[PDB]
Amino acid sequence: AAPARPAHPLDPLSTAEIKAATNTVKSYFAGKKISFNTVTLREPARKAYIQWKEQGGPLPPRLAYYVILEAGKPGVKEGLVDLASLSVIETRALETVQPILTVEDLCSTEEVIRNDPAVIEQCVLSGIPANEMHKVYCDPWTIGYDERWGTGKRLQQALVYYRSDEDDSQYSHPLDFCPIVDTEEKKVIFIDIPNRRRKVSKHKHANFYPKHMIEKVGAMRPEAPPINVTQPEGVSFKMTGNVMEWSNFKFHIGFNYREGIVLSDVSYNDHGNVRPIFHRISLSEMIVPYGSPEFPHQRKHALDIGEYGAGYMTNPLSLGCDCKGVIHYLDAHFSDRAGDPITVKNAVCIHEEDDGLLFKHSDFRDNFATSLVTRATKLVVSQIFTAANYEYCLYWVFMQDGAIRLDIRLTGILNTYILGDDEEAGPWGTRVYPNVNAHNHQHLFSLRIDPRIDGDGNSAAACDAKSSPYPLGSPENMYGNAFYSEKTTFKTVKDSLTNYESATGRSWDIFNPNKVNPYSGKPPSYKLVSTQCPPLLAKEGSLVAKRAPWASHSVNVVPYKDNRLYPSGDHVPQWSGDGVRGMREWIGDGSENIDNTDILFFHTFGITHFPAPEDFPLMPAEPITLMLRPRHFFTENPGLDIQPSYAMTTSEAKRAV
Amino acid sequence: AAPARPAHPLDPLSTAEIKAATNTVKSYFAGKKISFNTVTLREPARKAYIQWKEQGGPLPPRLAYYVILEAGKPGVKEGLVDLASLSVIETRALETVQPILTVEDLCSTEEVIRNDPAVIEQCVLSGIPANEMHKVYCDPWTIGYDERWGTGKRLQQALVYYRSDEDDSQYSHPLDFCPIVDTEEKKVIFIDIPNRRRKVSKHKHANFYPKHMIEKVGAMRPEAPPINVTQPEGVSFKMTGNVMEWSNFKFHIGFNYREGIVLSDVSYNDHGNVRPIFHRISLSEMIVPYGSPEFPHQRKHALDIGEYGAGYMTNPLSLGCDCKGVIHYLDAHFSDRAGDPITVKNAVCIHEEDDGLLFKHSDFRDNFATSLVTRATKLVVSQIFTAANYEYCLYWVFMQDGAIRLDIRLTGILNTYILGDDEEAGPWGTRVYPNVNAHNHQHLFSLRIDPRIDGDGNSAAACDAKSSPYPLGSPENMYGNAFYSEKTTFKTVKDSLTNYESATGRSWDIFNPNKVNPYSGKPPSYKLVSTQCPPLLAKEGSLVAKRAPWASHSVNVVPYKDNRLYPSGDHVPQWSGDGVRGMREWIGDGSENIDNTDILFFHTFGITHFPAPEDFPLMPAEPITLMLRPRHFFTENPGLDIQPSYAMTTSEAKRAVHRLAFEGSCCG
Ligand SMILES: [Cu+]
Ligand SMILES: [Cu+]
């Protein structure tokens, strides 16, 4: 009764595999009341995968990682199931952590608060009658961290809002108080109540559907005439299960509950020479730290990936109108609390689109009659997830010059808190609507790159543009114009801990010091070009800085070890930030070698958001991007064998008298 | 008889107006042998324009600015023609400047150097026999600045290359020497010859047409399947002559020989309140400073806009497709040296296209059945110009959230110089192909904004993200998470001279201190969000820093005066960089007021390029972008009245499918 093996060792667990895993765990815990928090692929060891792929090695065993809760027991148990033998092969109890909050965990909280007498009383005081609790809503957040309870109970905090009508957007009407909910007992254990009470706003809700806009401004704009994009002869990409082949790239598209999209085993076919570039690339953690110091707002610093899961939160893309053209979809499969497989249909959208000019050059000599123009196509692998108020639109983009870009668009709704009639929002927030305070915050992301640049044994470096040190008027720099790129190769982990610097236009290289470009004499590399790299604004030693040790630097590079995925640790909710785990453990004392070995490159990037009224009641998409581009990887522009859209040589131009 | 007036005072000169202007100038200089360097609109004074537009004032007079050379006179003469009276109304002689190099000025240089005995001898020494001079090519550059001649002669430098076959890309085969050419005498006056001779490369040319690639790698890829764009019901924008209306924006699209595209009189129609945003926005200058200190490479720091002209260099866009989709084109008109109008067809392309999601939100409570999503459309006004080896693709982009973006793509070919067999290219350059040294260089641009944010009387500020100054554990900042935006309003010119700073994620506001957003309490602004802001790497006091005094800071804000367009001065070629002109003049002693007045905001942005083999023999497009976004300008998202691509309310979702006194979440 063992489940069928996948097409490919990195494929996510099938529904049959998930059911097999949960059957096995229920049997192992026979007679105990357990509930499933996470059931997900435990990916093969890096060595095992690579030997299977390239050296005729054995197929790695199919393993399931699980996290469960047991009625009446603190914390969690976790372990591994060997799927071929239907057996639990590793197990341990962690009594003092709390795990990722699932959709089921969060879907239960509104009923809890609506029926709680102490919450009802606070609504009455706040100007909402006791019989109108159906109009009170909350966004159920991780408590994040609260030093009154630590990890001793599993807790949520309910950010409470009011709707006059169920079709309203509730965010114009936050209430003043914050219930704390025991997730497993399903009760309110405390309510944070501010010293200055602010009753519910009496303003109209700030709404945004067409029927609302017609009331607000009189009419919708006329429907614009259509801009139709078609691919009547299909696409150039080919999928074989989860394996993508496009413009010489080949890679595996994976997906899990936490990271969402995971791109693996990325190679480029350089005229028959298939060259590895990356073993794995994904987003591994986030943190969205808010900037109001007033209590209890310090508890808004969601680590969305580790506390809710970019997979668990992902939107089905069918009706989303962001997968246009001829597309390919992938589903995602998770477990529910009962241990049954659940599906998100069309979680991943794959499509190719026009990306402007790839390159062009014309000769002035014959008035540009000698000319070659080639248009670019990009391949886009995307998902969109919803983290209560916000939407994160993630686009992994492959390009025909061999570069890879991550484009993010942020949209959805500002998180809001109540503002008194006479209360000033600034300097920690903006009054984006009457009685609405949209607090300042950052959105920060931890990109995790496991490189294999042109094969094994890699290094990383900071690259800084510098004027020559010789002064103007010296024999060395007579006219003062000389400049160069200073490359600082990181020898130990400590050397790698570095920030973006505008003063040198810093970039970072990930390179293979065992190989040399036969033209330039430099090692083959991919260069990270990324300028949206905010400093972490929370202080050293703050709750934010402690729980996200990775976020303090733009770049952290540590040795590879299997299962080094998550840089705020494996179980993130309610960790105080004290202890050696995640990135803090990997960095250690900073002395380990990272030159010419198997490395892991974690990049912090994102934005700092000071809200303005343009962002409300629904925010226009805000862009974030970074690129990984080949430098000294190829010996020439690798797109030159793409047929031009137009080409005329000099001889041809002359012939056209 | 006088030429017909244009539809609009900001319209570029027509071919009839160009001919009228040059007729008028020829008559004024009766019996003299003159040649036309520039004939272009002299735009109306800002105040006059605005009085005309808004206050019932008179039509500004239609004026043509000209620059001419006269045989046997040094420098230039320039002046103004009043087109309605066909008379020269202002005139002056500038004996000690040199003007923009036109296509005709440049076109004869290659034949000059091919036929020069001293150049032929250097080719022979370099391994190219005299009977192969037809294989020798050069890119004709301005000399930039050479302290041996100043502006006393009008000079070009010829960067020399060799083609084995006319269809080669010549850039794999630079020669080692640099002829200096007198533009008006058409003769070689000097040749810079290096101490270390490097004879011509014996390698195959590094070529890139399909026939070349088939020989190099065996075959081309299969033709990929088409991606087609159609608009079967037409476009959403409306043009009335050069006036554009699209998604509540209205503005004038102008074009000239120098700046290329110029966007004027930009307003947004905010539900009946027509609100000004910018009076004028354009690129006003560039500089592309190379980073090898070895002679004569210091002379590679082209100021492409002021020395050749983004209009004069611009490609006809009919034949790519350069520009894809359903297109409205504009032509450009200039004068040639004889004073006749010339036309560049399809200089400017205008089109709208999909630009991803504009916004989306879904409610988890019913598993995202409650959802709204609206796709974005952008309007693009673009040109592409070729500066010898490089191509600059410029895209002015208007967005439906009210933002305006400038996107640039750089492509074309690296500038290359010869590298000896045993010679190291580094640290000033890269060996991108055998015997080829592609030197380091920056590409820097000066964006000129003449703002009119929600009307008249504007200011500018730097905005810096800062942690609270109170320490972790204080009553003010208990958990150490507090942070805010520090706004520093520029009071005087000197205050404005500011750089991008990664440490604070610096942005800049241009705002109207006379007005206030009734929700946020802040003035209406457009915020410049721009991170591709390199430091100028050339030292203080270098030739580069002196000729481009604007490039030293990311932001320069000076008082408005009429005719403050060009920050490296009006006549750029061969200016040493000494003297009080351009940005140096406008900054003055730094003391002038720029708070709540008419200001001009010059932004330096661009990239630092360290070449790699991927860039050769033809470079993949490298992007640069900056954005100007409304912040506190509107009181809510201005795109919300656009029809959603999909919408379902909670009540609709419930109908679609037909603890605890009160129920919890639908999904519970
Ligand atoms: Cu935000
Ligand atoms: Cu460049």
Structural domains in chain A, sorted by start = 1-102 (3.10.450.40), 108-216 (3.10.450.40), 217-655 (2.70.98.20)
- Which residues on A lie below 8 Å from B230 (Cβ)? 227-228, 230
Cα end-to-end distance, chain A, whole Å: 77
Of residues A171, A390, A500, A566, which has the active-site annotation? A390
Instruction: Give the Cα separation of B662 and B627 in Å (integer).
Output: 48
Instruction: Give the Cα separation of A122 and A193 in Å (integer).
Output: 9
Residue A126 — left, alpha, or beta (φ > 0 → left; ψ -120 to 50 → alpha)?
alpha
Chain gaps in chain B, named by the residue before each (C–N > 2.5 Å): 658
Calculate how close chain A gets to B190, using CA atoms only, in Å. Answer: 21
Ligand nearest to the CA of A288: 1
Chains A and B: how many Cβ contacts under 8 Å?
530
A232 vs B228: CB contact, 8 Å cut-off?
A: yes
Instruction: Give the Cα separation of A377 and A315 in Å (integer).
Output: 26
- A538 to each of A441, A499, B478, how far by Cα in Å? 10, 16, 11
Q: CA-based angle A232:A234:A240, to the nearest 5?
A: 165
Tell me, in angstroms, the distance from the centre of ligand 2 to residue A316's CA. 42
Coil, strand or helix: which one is B443? strand
Host H or E run for residue A54:
helix A46-54
Q: DSSP states of A374-395 as a string?
A: EEEEEEEEEEEEEETTEEEEEE
Check: CB of residue B155 under 8 Å from CB of residue B148. no
B642 vs A221: CB contact, 8 Å cut-off?
A: yes
List the single residue in B with minimal CA-CA distance to A270: B217
Host H or E run for residue B652:
helix B650-657
- Identify the residue among A640, A649, A652, A654 best suited for mutation to test binding to B, counting B beta carbons within 10 A and taking the highest: A640
Tell me, in angstroms, the distance from the centre of ligand 2 to residue A640's CA. 19
A484 vs B520: CB contact, 8 Å cut-off?
A: no
Ligand nearest to the CA of B391: 2
List the single residue in A with minimal CA-CA distance to B428: A484
Check: CB of residue B348 under 8 Å from CB of residue B259. no
CA B446 from chain centre, in angstroms, equals: 7
Nearest to A630 by CA among A526, A494, A486, A489: A526
Nearest to A615 by CA among B401, B375, B377: B401
Name which of A133, A221, A621 is nearest B359 (Cβ-Cβ): A621
Residue B551 — left, alpha, or beta (φ > 0 → left; ψ -120 to 50 → alpha)?
alpha
- Identify the residue among A227, A405, A641, A642 best suited for mutation to test binding to B, counting B beta carbons within 10 A and taking the highest: A227
Nearest to A547 by CA among A582, A587, A577: A577
A475: DSSP letter: T
Tell me, in angstroms, the distance from the centre of ligand 2 to residue B550's CA. 20
The method recorded for this entry reads X-ray
Omega before B129 within 30 of 0, i.e. cis: no
Instruction: Give the Cα separation of B469 and A427 in Å (integer).
Output: 12
Residue with tokens 């025909």: A400
CA A370 from chain centre, in angstroms, equals: 45
Name which of A320, A470, A484 is nearest B440 (Cβ-Cβ): A484
Resolution (A): 1.9
Check: CB of residue A105 under 8 Å from CB of residue A313. no
Calculate how close chain A gets to B61, using CA atoms only, in Å. Answer: 35
- B11 to each of B55, B62, B264, how far by Cα in Å? 20, 10, 10
A362 vs B630: CB contact, 8 Å cut-off?
A: no
Residue A204 — left, alpha, or beta (φ > 0 → left; ψ -120 to 50 → alpha)?
beta
- A51 to each of A54, A58, A559, how far by Cα in Å? 5, 8, 20
Instruction: Give the Cα separation of B294 and B421 in Å (integer).
Output: 18
Beta bridge partners of B449: B281, B601
Cβ contacts of residue B302 below 8 Å, gap of 6+?
Answer: B141, B142, B144, B286, B287, B288, B308, B387
Check: CB of residue A249 under 8 Å from CB of residue A326. no
- Which residues on B lie below 8 Å from A400 (Cβ)? 620
Question: Was A450 annotated as part of a binding site?
Answer: yes
CA B504 from chain centre, in angstroms, equals: 27
Cβ contacts of residue B215 below 8 Å, gap of 6+?
Answer: none
Q: Where are the alpha helices (DSSP H) in B450-563?
A: 493-496, 543-547
Nearest to A462 by CA among A556, A592, A535: A556
Calculate how close chain B gets to A197, using CA atoms only, in Å. Answer: 20
Question: Was B392 annotated as part of a binding site?
Answer: yes
Coil, strand or helix: which one is A356? strand
A618 vs B483: CB contact, 8 Å cut-off?
A: no
Tokens in use for A492?
A: 């130990």
A539 vs B630: CB contact, 8 Å cut-off?
A: no
Instruction: Give the Cα separation of A293 and A299 in Å (integer).
Output: 10
A646 is catalytic: no
List the single residue in B with minimal CA-CA distance to A482: B291
Instruction: Give the Cα separation of A116 and A187 in Å (integer).
Output: 7
Tokens in use for A441?
A: 């915050």
B209-215 long-range CB contacts below 8 Å, 24 or more apart?
A: B209/A372, B209/A644, B209/A647, B209/A649, B209/B167, B210/A643, B210/A644, B210/A647, B211/A649, B211/B167, B212/B167, B213/A640, B213/A641
Question: Was A599 annotated as part of a binding site?
Answer: yes
A433 is catalytic: no
- Identify the residue among A109, A172, A273, A502 best suited for mutation to test binding to B, counting B beta carbons within 10 A and taking the highest: A502
Amino acid at A113: I
Check: CB of residue B288 under 8 Å from CB of residue B305. no
Tell me, in angstroms, the distance from the centre of ligand 1 to residue B362's CA. 17
Tell me, in angstroms, the distance from the centre of ligand 1 to residue A611's CA. 7
Q: CA-based angle A80:A84:A85, to the nearest 5?
A: 75
Coil, strand or helix: which one is A19? helix
- Which residues on B lie below 8 Å from A325 (Cβ)? 227
- A520 to each of A158, A400, A402, B414, B424, how far by Cα in Å? 58, 22, 18, 14, 10
Of residues A146, A304, A454, A509, which has the active-site annotation? A304
Q: Side by side, which strands form the sheet with A436-439?
A: A417-418, A436-439, A429-433
Question: Was A443 annotated as part of a binding site?
Answer: yes
Question: Was A279 annotated as part of a binding site?
Answer: no
Residue B438 — left, alpha, or beta (φ > 0 → left; ψ -120 to 50 → alpha)?
beta
Instruction: Give the Cα separation of B122 and A600 in Å (integer).
Output: 54
Check: CB of residue B647 under 8 Å from CB of residue A209. yes
Tokens in use for A122?
A: 């606070």
